Amino acid sequence: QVNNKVLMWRLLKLSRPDLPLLVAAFFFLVLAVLGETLIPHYSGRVIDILGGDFDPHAFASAIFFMCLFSFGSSLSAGCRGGCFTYTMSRINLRIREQLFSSLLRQDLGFFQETKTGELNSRLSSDTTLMSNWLPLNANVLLRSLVKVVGLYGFMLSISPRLTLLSLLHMPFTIAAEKVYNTRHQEVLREIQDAVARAGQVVREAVGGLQTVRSFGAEEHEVCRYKEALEQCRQLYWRRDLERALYLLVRRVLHLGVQMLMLSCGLQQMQDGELTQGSLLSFMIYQESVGSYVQTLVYIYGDMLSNVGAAEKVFSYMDRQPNLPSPGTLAPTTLQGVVKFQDVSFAYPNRPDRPVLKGLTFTLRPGEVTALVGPNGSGKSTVAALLQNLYQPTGGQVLLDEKPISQYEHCYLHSQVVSVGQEPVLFSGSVRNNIAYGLQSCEDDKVMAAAQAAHADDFIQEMEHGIYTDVGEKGSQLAAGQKQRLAIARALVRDPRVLILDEATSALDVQCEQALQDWNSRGDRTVLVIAHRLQTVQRAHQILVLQEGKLQ
Amino acid sequence: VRRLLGCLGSETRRLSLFLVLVVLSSLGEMAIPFFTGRLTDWILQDGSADTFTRNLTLMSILTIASAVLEFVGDGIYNNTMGHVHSHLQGEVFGAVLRQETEFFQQNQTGNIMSRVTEDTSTLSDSLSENLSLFLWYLVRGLCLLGIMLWGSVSLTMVTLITLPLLFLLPKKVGKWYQLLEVQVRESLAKSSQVAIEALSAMPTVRSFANEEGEAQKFREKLQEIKTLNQKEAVAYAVNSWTTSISGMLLKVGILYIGGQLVTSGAVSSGNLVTFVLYQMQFTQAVEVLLSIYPRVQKAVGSSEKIFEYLDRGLLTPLHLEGLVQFQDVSFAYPNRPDVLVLQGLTFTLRPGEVTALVGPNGSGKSTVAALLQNLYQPTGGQLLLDGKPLPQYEHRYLHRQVAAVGQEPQVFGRSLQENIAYGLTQKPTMEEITAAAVKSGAHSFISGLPQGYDTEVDEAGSQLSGGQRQAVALARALIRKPCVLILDDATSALDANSQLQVEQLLYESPERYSRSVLLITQHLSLVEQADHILFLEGGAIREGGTHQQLMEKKGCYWAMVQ
C-alpha cells in the first residue's frame, strides 16, 4: 500500500506550484459553506419573529440579511468552482509537457520496445485522469469537513442536549454500514463467480455450435443455460434482499433518533429554553449532516482507489535512459576522417544475435566509400551507429582519433548527416522540412540545396514558393519528391560525413552524380550504400557486406 | 415501446399490489413534518399531554408502518422483475441459438453473440434499478404536492411556478460550458496528435537533433490551449453561480410570502414550518428524479436494438432404409452465392455400402456433408433420404438417424462420460457405454484417466489428445448407432490402431450390413477398399467405381493415386 502513498506524495509534489490557486479555492469554499448554513438559522429567526406579536422592521431586516448572505454564498461558490477548474487545467498542461519532455530523451531501444498507440493512450487519457485527481478529491474532502464542523458548531449553539442525542446515533450507523458492506461484498464475489459460470456455457455454445447442430439439438444446451440462470437468479435475489433489509434498519434508526430528538426538543419547549424556529433549524441541520459525515469517511477509501491511474505515467517518467554520458568535445575544425576498428554490435532489444563481428574499415575525406550487398537488410545498422544512435557492444568507433560519444549532441549530427532509405517528412511547411533541425537560417540558404538536389523544378511550380504546406508525414509528394526533399535537407546543412542510402536506386542517377559532385562531396567523406555494383563506376573503395562480415 | 409493457404484463397481478404498497408507503413517511408543526403549534397553544402522547405514538406507528410497507413492496417488485429478467435472458438465448447456419456461417461474428446476451443482462439490471427509483420518487413527489396543495394553494403556486426557473436555467447555461469543453478536448487531441507524430519518427529526429524543436512546438500548442482553458473556467464559474442562486433565492421568497400570509392570518406558524420541510423534501425528490430520465432513455434505446436482434419438417420413420440420392444437387454458400461449391453432383450411397470421395481439398466435400446432414439447404436439386427429402425429416429424427463426425470435431467441455453422449435424449447404459468405448478404440484412452470416463475434460480439448478427440468423436457416432454415417476425418491424424479399428467397423462390423457409410477422408488404405470410390473435383464428379476400375480408367482417381 506504500506504492499508493508515494504516488500521492508525487502528485502533491507535482501540484506544489499551484499553491495560491488552491489557497484561494479553499478560502472561497470556506466562505460559501459559512454563508450557506446561515440561511436555516435566519429561517428559524424569521419563524420566531412571525410568532407572538408582529414587527415589520425585524422581519424586513431578517429578509434583507437572508438575501445578502445568499448572494454572497452563491458568488463565493462560483468563484471556488472556477478556481478549481482552472487549477485542474493548469495541472493537466504541466504534466503533459513534463511527460513529453521526459519521453523525448529516451533511446531508440525504448521506442522499439514499446508501442506508439500505447504512448498515445497514456498521453491522451492518463494525464487527464491524473489531473482530475487532486482538485476534485480536495474539494470533496474540504467541503465535507468544513460543512461537518460548521453544522456541529451551529447545532451545539442551538442546544447541547439535542446535539448529544444526535451524536449518540452515529456509531450504530457506522457499525451497520460496515457490516452491510462486508456482507454485500461477500455476496458480490459469489455473484461474479455465478455470472462467470453462466457465461462459460454460452461461450462453449458459440464456440461449438457447429458440433452442437451436427449431433444433437439446441435444447440440451439451452436448458443447461436456464439452469445456470436459476442459480444466478437466486443469488441476485439474496443480494437485493439483504440490501432492502439494511435500508429498513437505517430508516428505522433514523426514525428512532428523530422521534427521540423531537420529544426532547418539545420538552425544552415547555422549559422556555428553546423556540419554534430553533427547533426547525435543528431539524434542518440534523437532516443535512448525515451525507457529509458519511462522505468524510468514504473519501479516504475513494482516494486510494482512484490514485491507481498515475503509476504508468510516473513509471514512464522515471525510466533511466541507457545512453552514455553526454559529450563535451566541439572543435570548429574537422578533418572528416572516420575509421572503424573491430566493432561488433547487437540489438539490445533482441540480444544474442550478433549482426556485426569485428568489422573494421577506414574512411577518408577525399576518397569516397561504397558498401554493396543486401546483408539481409543489415546495412542500416552500420549507418545508425555512425550517427551515435547506438553504442557498439564491442570495439569502438572514432572520429578524428576521438570516440564519437564524446562529441556534442547538437553538433555531431550537424556535421554528420545521412539520408534514410525511406524519407520521412513532417506536417509543417516545405521550408520547415528542408531547414529541419536548424534553429535559425536565412531563407536564401534553402533553395540552393533544392537546386543542388534537383527539387527546384516543383518549387517554382507550387504556389507561394517554398512557404507552402504538405500533408502529415507526406501526402501530396511522391516517392521521388520525398527523396529529393530529403537530399536537399541533408545538403543544406553543409555536412562533413554524408551517408547516402540508395539515392540512384529510386530517383534518377543524374541527381546522385550531382550529389557526388556537389559541395558536400568535394572535400568531405561520403559513404554510399547500394544493392548493386552499379555504384562502382564512381566509387573509389568498395566493401561488400554479407552475413555481417566484411570482404 | 409496447414491447417492454408486453414483456412486463406477465407480472401485472403482483405489480398492481406493488403500486398499492408504494402509494401506501409514500403516504405514510410524510407524517413526520406534519406532526412536528402540529405539535409545535399545540405546545405553543398550551396543549394537553393526552393530545400530545397520542400524536407522538401515531406518528411513530405511521412511520414504522411506512418503512415496513416500503420493504415489502421492494421485495415483491424485485422478485417479480428478477423473474422476468431470467425469463427474458432464457428466451433471447433460445432465439439466438435458433438462428440458421447461414446467419452463423461467419465465425468472426462469434464475438457479438458472446456479448449481446450479457449486455442484455446488465441492460435489464440497469433499467431495473432505474425504473424502481424513478417510479418511487414520482409517487412520492406527487404525494408531497398533494399535502402541499392541502397546506396553502396561494403559496404553493409560488413553488410550482419557480421550479422551471431553477430547473431549466442551468440546462440552458451549461450548453456554453459544454461547447467550450468540446473545443478544449479537440485542441488537446490535436496537440496529442502532433506529439505522437513527433514521437513515431524518433530515428530521424534523433539523427537531426531536434528534440528541443518538438518540445517548443508542444509548448506552443499548450500555450494556444491555455486561453480556451481560461474561458472554460469562466463558464464553469458562471454555471455554478447561477445553479446555486437559483435554488438559494427561492427559500427566501417562500418565507417572505409565508410571512405575508401569516400576518394576514391565513395560516399559522406551524403550517409554515411543515411547508418549509415539505418544500425541501419535494425539491430533493424532483432534483433526483430529473437525473434518471437520460439513463432510462439510453436503456430503452439499447433495448430497441436488443429486440430488433431478437426479431432475427416432422417426418418420424420407424426405421431407416439407408438410401441416399441426389437430383441435380448444387449448393451455394449465402456469403458467396456467385460461386457454387457443388454443381449438380450425383452420388448415391446404398445401405450396407461404402462411398469414398477422392479429390482436391476445398472441392466441396464439406458442402455435401452439410447437405446430407440438412444443416444448410442446397442451392439447386433435391436430396432424397430413402426417396424422401432431407429437410422434410424432423430435426431430432434426422439427428438420431444420420450422424457424423466433422473435419475438426471439438470435445465438449464436460465429463468424458458425458461428452461421449452429448445430445442423447435417453441416457445410455453403463454396459452400452463400455461397449461403445471398446468398439471405437477409445477404451484405451478412456481407461488411461485416473478417474475413468467420469473425469472432466477442459474446454477446447486441452486435456484430450487429437487422436483421443477423434476416438471420442467416433465413439459418440458409434454410440448413436446411426444408419447413415459420414466418416469425415475420423482417423486422418490418429494412430494406426485407431485407423484399423475404424476400417474394421466400416467393413467387418456386424452392423455394417444394415448401415450406410460415406467416407470423406485421407485414409489411403481405406480408400482402395471401398465398395464405391467416386472422384469429385470442382463440384463435379469426374470418375467413379472400384479402385482397380478407377486405375484402369486412367481418370482423375488414377492420376491422384499414381
Numbering used by the authors:
A (entry chain B): 131 to 681
B (entry chain A): 173 to 484, 492 to 741
Paper quotes:
Peptides destined for display are first delivered into the endoplasmic reticulum (ER) by the transporter associated with antigen processing (TAP). In this study, we analyzed the structure of TAP in the presence and absence of peptides. These structures show that TAP suspends peptides across its transmembrane cavity, anchoring their termini in two distal binding pockets primarily through their backbone atoms.
We determined the cryo-EM structures of TAP in the absence of peptide (apo) and presence of six different peptides between seven and 14 residues long. In the absence of b27, TAP hydrolyzed ATP at a specific turnover rate of 2 per minute. All structures exhibit similar NBD-separated conformations in which the peptide-translocation pathway is open to the cytoplasm.
